[PDB]
Design a protein around this ligand. Sequence first.
Ligand SMILES: [Cl-]
Length: 270
Amino acid sequence: APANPQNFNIYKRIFTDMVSSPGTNCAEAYHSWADLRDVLFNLCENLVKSSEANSPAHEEFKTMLLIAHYYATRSAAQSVKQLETVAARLSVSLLRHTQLLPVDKAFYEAGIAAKAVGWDNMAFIFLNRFLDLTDAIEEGTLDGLDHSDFQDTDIPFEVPLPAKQHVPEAEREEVRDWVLTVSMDLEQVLPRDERGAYEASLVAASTGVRALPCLITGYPILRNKIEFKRPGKAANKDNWNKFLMAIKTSHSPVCQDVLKFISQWCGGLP
Ligand SMILES: [Cl-]
C-alpha cells in the first residue's frame, strides 16, 4: 500500500466513473461535467507547478481535461436549440477518444445525435457500429468487429471492451429496428472534407498533417483558425461566433460558464 500524494488514482477513477455513468447525455448534466472539468483543470494547474509536468500522467490528465471540456460544452450546447449541430459534432469528435470512454456509449450517442440533426449516413454507420459493439460486449471479444468503415480515420480500433452494456435494451432495440429498416436501401460512407479525409478526423490520411481540434466542436480546424494565448488551443472562428451568438441571444448561464472556463484555461479571449 503506497501513498498517492498527487491523487492521480482518485482523479483517474472519478473521470472513468463519470464517463461510464448513465443519464449524462442531456443539458441537465452540465454541472456534473463542468465539475469534472473544473477539478481536472485544477489538477493540471498543480502538475505544472509541482514540476511533474509532461510525464505521461500529466499528458493523460490533460487529455481527460479536454474530454471533460467536450462533454460540458456538449451539455451547454444541448441547452439551446440553435446549438444542436454543435452538440452533435461534439459527440462525433468524442469518438476519437474512445480509448478512454465506454465505446458502446460513445457510438450510440454519436449516432443518435447525428440522426436527430438529419446526418443519416453518419447515424447509420455509428449506430451499426454500436450494435456490433453491444454484441461484442455480450460475446466477450472484439474479434468480430469490422473496422472497414473507419479505416483512414483517427477513430481507434483497439479499444477497451466494456464488461457491461451502457445502453438499456429498449434503446438498443429501437436502434436495431431503425438500422434494419434503413439497411433496405443511402450511401454508407463517412463524409469527407476538402482534405479528402473523414470530416471529423484530425489526421488527414492523405496529407499527414494533424489538424488542431476546435475548442467548440472538436472538428479539425481547416480554415478561419483563431488562436488562444495557451499554445495548442484554437477554435474555428465560425464555431466561436456561433457559440457567442447563442450566449448573446439566450443569456445561457451554462454557455457563459463554458466561455468563462475557456478564457481561464487558455489565458483570455482570443
Ligand atoms: Cl499520486
